[PDB]
Symmetry: C2
Subunit: 257 residues, 2 copies
Amino acid sequence: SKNPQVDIAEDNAFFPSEYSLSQYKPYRGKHKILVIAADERYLPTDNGKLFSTGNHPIETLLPLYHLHAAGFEFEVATISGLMTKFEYWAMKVMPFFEQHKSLFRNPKKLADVVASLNSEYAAIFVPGGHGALIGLPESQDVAAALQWAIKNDRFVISLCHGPAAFLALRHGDNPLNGYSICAFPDAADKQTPEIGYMPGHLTWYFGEELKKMGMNIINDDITGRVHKDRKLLTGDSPFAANALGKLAAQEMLAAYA
Amino acid sequence: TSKNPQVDIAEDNAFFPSEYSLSKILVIAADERYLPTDNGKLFSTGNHPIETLLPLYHLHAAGFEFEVATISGLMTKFEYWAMPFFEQHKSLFRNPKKLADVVASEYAAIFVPGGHGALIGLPESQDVAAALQWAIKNDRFVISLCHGPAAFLALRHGDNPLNGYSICAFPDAADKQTPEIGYMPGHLTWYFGEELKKMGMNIINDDITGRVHKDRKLLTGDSPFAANALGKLAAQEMLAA
């Protein structure tokens, strides 16, 4: 069935439709990966209905897995400090998540992390899933985290709707000005209601917005494409999660060697 | 019907209550739905919808327009599990202001509704405290019920102007027993009744009856059964004054 399933937990909130559900030499330093996760599950669509989204689990674990193996551990932070929110309808990888569940369930508040920066962080990771569209793009704290990152020549990793977080640099410096990225294409977000992925359309579109703030989205299709621009690495979709982790590892490894 | 905690698919290891057990004004509501219990399992909770609508509906008639705020700014989280006026004001609950930002800036209130959601964040909020200090230092009304009063725990590490005050509140005893029927997937990691006592407040009830209570500009109820009768009091007290 291509009809949106209901999330009994929330008012007027829907999971993705049933049909679309199946469619759809290490580093021994001290530098950790700062993970910026989503603290809100529900995204409001154009017809009042709520998309039951969150962070996409394969997108956020696969890379973190490749990095963990390459001697790069991680910590998690949300804007509020509230537990991470995962799209569990998109859940080797299991034991990894289980063994690291705590880090996502009890993250730090991003503001606290930012006030202690100057810093054994080797990357900022902003995982995708439409959950990235809630809050991140408006966070002064996300903004600053990102400023710190590029300013101190650190790595920045993202995929899917991850890049929407960069929209937070829209008012200030924007050190990501004139960077190129892979990202989830808007043209795909306009036609996903069709198969009941979401109960409605997005109010605004992140890809269009990033173009206005100087970022070059190099892809308009979903292929699992990954891209490199200096130290900013990105992927276009869930299909890129593995290749992205493969890239993040073999780029932060040669950088730290 | 079984006393089995119903699963909540939206979250990992999260449970609704068992299908058996289910049978100016400034509002500070919960921005988080899941409360962790002592066995790792998450209790799918939030604000109690009847407890935050009935009192506000009585209020809100006799002309008192409410305004919602959560710590983070994220949308209100309601215990929709059973559990007109809602739809009409839904927009205020779904698009609340950050509390911290409302602190820097008029109201005739603070209302802190119940539901176990109130146990998440509020009890430890520097913003909640600062807001709560404002209401007392200005002789404004403070309304709360169920676990709502757990928010007062925010003044803990301050001077505590709520010292001595007496209140109604959901009894710790009753919480120690709800799991045995599936209302909760586990036991609470701590109990606010004891804490409020340690802080220096008088919990004048040890049972659930629907009793509401008044102490200066501080009105409270004990459970959902008090939501209505509480609205009755908040109305009177705000009207006549």
